[PDB]
Design a binder for these strands. Structure first.
Ligand SMILES: [K+]
Ligand SMILES: [Mg+2]
Ligand SMILES: [Mg+2]
Ligand SMILES: [Mg+2]
Ligand SMILES: [Mg+2]
Ligand SMILES: [Mg+2]
Ligand SMILES: [Mg+2]
Ligand SMILES: [Mg+2]
Ligand SMILES: [Mg+2]
Ligand SMILES: [Mg+2]
Ligand SMILES: [Mg+2]
Ligand SMILES: [Mg+2]
Ligand SMILES: [Mg+2]
Ligand SMILES: [Mg+2]
Ligand SMILES: [Mg+2]
Ligand SMILES: [Mg+2]
Ligand SMILES: [Mg+2]
Ligand SMILES: [Mg+2]
Ligand SMILES: [Mg+2]
Ligand SMILES: [Mg+2]
Ligand SMILES: [Mg+2]
Ligand SMILES: [Mg+2]
Ligand SMILES: [Mg+2]
Ligand SMILES: [Mg+2]
Ligand SMILES: [Mg+2]
Ligand SMILES: [Mg+2]
Ligand SMILES: [Mg+2]
Ligand SMILES: [Mg+2]
Ligand SMILES: [Mg+2]
Ligand SMILES: [Mg+2]
Ligand SMILES: [Mg+2]
Ligand SMILES: [Mg+2]
Ligand SMILES: [Mg+2]
Ligand SMILES: [Mg+2]
Ligand code: NA
Ligand code: NA
Ligand code: NA
Lengths: 50, 55, 112, 47, 73, 152
RNA sequence: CGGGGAAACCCAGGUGGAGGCCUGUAGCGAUGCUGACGUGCAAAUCGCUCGUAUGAUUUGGGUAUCGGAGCGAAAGACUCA
RNA sequence: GCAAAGAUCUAACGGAGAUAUACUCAACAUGCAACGUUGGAUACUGGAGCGGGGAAGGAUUUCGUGCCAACGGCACUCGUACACGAGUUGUUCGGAAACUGAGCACAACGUUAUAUCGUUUUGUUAGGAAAGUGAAGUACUGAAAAGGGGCAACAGAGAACCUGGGAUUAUAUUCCAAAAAGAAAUUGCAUGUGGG
RNA sequence: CCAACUGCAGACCGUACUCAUCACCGCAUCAGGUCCCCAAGCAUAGAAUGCUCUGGUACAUAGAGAAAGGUAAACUCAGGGAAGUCGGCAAAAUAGAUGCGUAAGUUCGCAAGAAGCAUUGGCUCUGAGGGCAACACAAAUUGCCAACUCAGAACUGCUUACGGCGGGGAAUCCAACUGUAUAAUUAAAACAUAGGUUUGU
RNA sequence: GUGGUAAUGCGCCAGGUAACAAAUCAAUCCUCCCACGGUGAGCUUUCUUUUCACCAUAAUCCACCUUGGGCCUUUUUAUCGCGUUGUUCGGAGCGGGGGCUCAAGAUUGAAAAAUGCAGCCAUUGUUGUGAGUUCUGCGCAUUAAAGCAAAAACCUGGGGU
């Protein structure tokens, strides 16, 4: 609901900023192994519980 | 049919300090407005009778 | 409420009357069929719960495409709009002609 | 924020409203005193 | 909002250094002079047009006079 | 094409449910072009979107039945489901009767038809359930006055 | 408040609204069908029927007592399947 | 096996999702089934609501434009899915600043080989010297006032603001600009007008 | 020094959305679980139950369609009426309101809705029950007006016809009673209870 | 500081507010129904002076009739009077005549038509009665071997300054 402390809000904001796909040019680098993020999180699959 | 109202001041429990009244506005809407608490008023000492003072 | 009502008394319902007054209503039909209209009102304006037989209490006149009703009894202005719609229902004009109030005591015919 | 507006641009702010966004940054809505034109200030800023 | 009962009091208020403007409102049978001032809006009601004209004419030129109308919708 | 956005905005602007918003089925191209509340307001002004009236719920049958009931129909032995006390509370009946009797006695004492002694005598009897109605009490008062006249 | 009585008291009509009182919703439970289901909607649920429903009543948040210890209107019940 | 919660029908528009054919053959007997939107019809929820707002819990699921590989145990042109770009505005609303409750336990003291133990609101810490101030006379300086410091209620106490808006795609008792659409209340410090 | 007027200033954090037959817990968009506020019309005693305007919904895989055998918050059944079965299990059955009437037993409170008998529709009428306005005693009367309930009469009709709503009687055993209680096979005669008694101080 | 016989009106220490339960009966705001009237829409083969919708007024201020409590002064009451739906009050001052106060409404205005709504540069614009509702008032007598939190902050007085 409405209430949360600011520190909790900032932790949730960092997770929101992290939840993104790999930019395409990263796959073109010499000797690259990254294909997908593999740390993607969906709100309805795994809980953070902050 | 009829109108139904909501709380507007972020406290949704009907305690003695959160009494409401229903008022119709110039825009023809029905809204809740908070009713102030009231004091019992000035009294003589409790041991002497506890009566309300004139004037 | 003070006096219990009887079924048999439903044969005579009498309108209230104007104490020291006389009301006037006018319908502006300015916009061939000026007949079949005054007489339509004459034989279809209910008075004292009885159609037709308009005595001296209600009077009509059709002047310059305008129809006036002068009465000393209490009538709602809505009643003559109701009669006008009943009239326009028969001739099948309701899709073009409409009636709108234009002032106190005054109705007017208009186009859609 | 009001004092910084006065220093950085020669404008006077009559009202500052603030919020903290869900991504963590702070945003300010700043109203000028109607003796300055926000459009001209925006043009000078370059936006 | 406060009422003013007298022309003398209305003049004294209209001449204060904080009277921003006076809105003149015409009603079917009365005229209302409303002075914005600083904390309160002051209203003087006149029921006579012959006096209302002299009041509308006796205005200082430091204060602005505004005719109240229904503004563009 | 989908006019969901226009229907939602028109519901918000006109202040009704979606069942009362009417979108013209021949002006779909025009309605497709409105993306803001301002544009939808212009559509409403031009008449491609209108508000329908509510459905009818008529009270005519109830009014006719009420006329019959006031005349005295449909309330016999076979139509009663609640108990007599639930239909007409005896405490309410007693309160009405006693208030009537006390008001009558006050009027007579103020108008000087009876004195304080007769008032005080009848007040306690009215509390004691000696008089069944206003006419009963009035007849008792008249009997008192007649006997007093003869003896005096 | 009416009637009776030497007295002590007795008979009757109202008013009033008591109770771990009665019938019955919401709530809190769980009798019978030994009904459904029994690789379930569900690692205990569903339907009808049934107990109680102003009290030793039901319920939110806070707070206090645990592992040979705690808590228990006492079933070796319950202490995160 | 995908059977509780009664139920859909019709036309037009949209879409690759059709009216999709070798001879022969006018059409049936050789392209079925299924979908979104608008209008119309028919029903259901039935104010202890598949209505409108909040706490706990969740944390972008919210809004717009696209897209339809996987996922939404049938389906999809649709989605709480996927991509890109956006959105939460307060002197007065809730909290804190600033109350006390059931309670907690820092200091002090005691105990223990061991503090990671005990006491700590029945007016109240500690064998216990726990007060740092106004005022008088420019900071300074030094008389009174037993019982140390703090936490614990977003439903108890406390708490100065109301309507209108043609003002959003999405926020509003928070946004609106001098005719502030406007009308108020309240706190701090300074001017001057009257009175001490 | 004291209002009041006027000038200037009024800091911090929260604020999207959800709150559930899809946003929370139950491995899931699971017929389970989860605190608070607002609450319309008619029938009716009514927050029972049935239907409806406002707001909401047509989402839960569908189509064609007379097998047997199932499940049901689905029905009937001639004659008999518990013969069935461990056992009337299940089903049937009673039923609202008003008047009359009501046994043994009893801690005098009850038992009791004991048991039982009768009436009830529709239509047209009649009566009763009120308010405030105008030392001398039938203003003991004139006018105006509301809201519903109860009682009586004439005429007329039944195919006994929505929903909702106790079956009753005579006895034995146990426990005084209301309550609690083996979450997931035991709700009892078990536990508690008021009352009685004893012990330490 | 100052008026009125008075109830009471105007410019360190001691009390009070915060501060607390049931039922009954009245209840205001608000909701619903009805009567009368204005505006729009529906039905119309027939019938229907008809059926449906709408007719709005926020905080904050000015001035000053009704109900319910407490009290003052004058006339002094008694087996007797006053009063509630209800379990009661009076020489420790009942009732009547005049007043003083408090609580809750009302009625004037200001705000405020300049707003809102609905037909279409113009029209409209509402006043009465029932029923239900816990604010509030009935001041602080619900079972009771049950008797119904506290503090900050604030208010008034007694004293001296
Ligand atoms: K199969
Ligand atoms: Mg009784
Ligand atoms: Mg009971
Ligand atoms: Mg019961
Ligand atoms: Mg055992
Ligand atoms: Mg199937
Ligand atoms: Mg089904
Ligand atoms: Mg239905
Ligand atoms: Mg959380
Ligand atoms: Mg699928
Ligand atoms: Mg995503
Ligand atoms: Mg903020
Ligand atoms: Mg404590
Ligand atoms: Mg301490
Ligand atoms: Mg604290
Ligand atoms: Mg609070
Ligand atoms: Mg606040
Ligand atoms: Mg929103
Ligand atoms: Mg919000
Ligand atoms: Mg909810
Ligand atoms: Mg579920
Ligand atoms: Mg989950
Ligand atoms: Mg129900
Ligand atoms: Mg038989
Ligand atoms: Mg046998
Ligand atoms: Mg046998
Ligand atoms: Mg059985
Ligand atoms: Mg019987
Ligand atoms: Mg027992
Ligand atoms: Mg029992
Ligand atoms: Mg068990
Ligand atoms: Mg069992
Ligand atoms: Mg036992
Ligand atoms: Mg009460
Ligand atoms: Na079974
Ligand atoms: Na109901
Ligand atoms: Na048979």
């Amino acid at each position: 609901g409405r209430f949360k402390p600011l520190a909790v809000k900032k932790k949730y904001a960092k997770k929101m900023n992290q939840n993104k796909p790999v930019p395409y040019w990263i796959r073109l680098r010499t000797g690259n192994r990254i294909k997908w993020n593999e740390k993607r999180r969906h709100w309805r699959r795994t809980k953070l519980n902050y | 049919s009829c109108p139904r109202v909501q709380y507007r001041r972020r406290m949704h429990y009907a305690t003695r300090g959160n009494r409401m009244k229903m008022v119709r506005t110039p825009g023809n809407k029905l809204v809740m407005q908070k009713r102030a608490k009231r004091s019992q008023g000035i009294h003589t000492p409790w041991v002497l009778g506890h009566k309300r003072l004139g004037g | 409420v003070a006096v219990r009502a009887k079924v048999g008394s439903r044969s005579y319902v009498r309108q209230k009357q104007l104490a020291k007054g006389k009301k006037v209503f006018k319908i502006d039909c300015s916009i061939d069929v000026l007949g079949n209209f005054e007489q339509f009102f004459q034989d279809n304006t209910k008075l004292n719960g009885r159609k037709g037989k308009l005595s001296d209490k209600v009077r009509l006149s059709m002047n310059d495409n305008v129809l006036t009703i002068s009465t000393t009894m209490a009538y709602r202005k809505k009643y003559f709009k109701y009669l006008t719609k009943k009239f326009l229902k028969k001739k099948d004009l309701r899709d073009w002609i409409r009636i709108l109030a234009t002032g106190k005591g005054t109705y007017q015919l208009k186009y859609f | 924020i009001k004092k910084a507006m006065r220093k950085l641009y020669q404008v006077k702010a009559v009202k500052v409203n603030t919020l903290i966004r869900p991504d963590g940054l702070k945003k300010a809505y700043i109203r000028l005193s109607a003796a300055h034109d926000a459009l001209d200030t925006a043009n000078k800023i370059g936006l | 909002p406060r009422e003013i009962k007298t022309l003398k009091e209305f003049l004294a208020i209209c001449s204060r250094k904080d009277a921003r403007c006076v809105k003149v409102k015409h009603n079917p049978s009365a005229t209302k002079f409303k002075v914005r001032c600083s904390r309160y809006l002051y209203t003087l009601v006149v029921n006579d047009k012959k006096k209302a004209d002299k009041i509308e004419r006796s205005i200082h030129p430091s204060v602005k006079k505004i005719a109240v109308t229904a503004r563009s919708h | 094409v989908s006019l969901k956005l226009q229907a939602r905005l028109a519901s918000s602007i006109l202040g009704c449910g979606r069942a009362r918003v009417w979108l013209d089925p021949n002006e779909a191209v025009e309605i497709q072009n409105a993306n803001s509340r301002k544009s939808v307001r212009k559509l409403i002004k031009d008449g491609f979107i209108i508000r329908k009236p509510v459905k009818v719920h008529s009270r005519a049958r109830w009014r006719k039945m009420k006329e019959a009931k006031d005349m005295g129909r449909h309330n016999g032995v076979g139509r009663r489901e609640g108990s007599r006390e639930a239909r007409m509370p005896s405490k309410e009946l007693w309160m009405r009767r006693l208030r009537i009797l006390r008001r009558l006695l006050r009027k007579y004492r103020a108008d000087k038809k009876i004195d304080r002694h007769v008032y005080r005598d009848l007040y306690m009897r009215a509390k004691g359930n000696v008089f069944r109605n206003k006419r009963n009490l009035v007849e008792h008062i008249h009997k008192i006055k007649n006997e007093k006249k003869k003896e005096r």
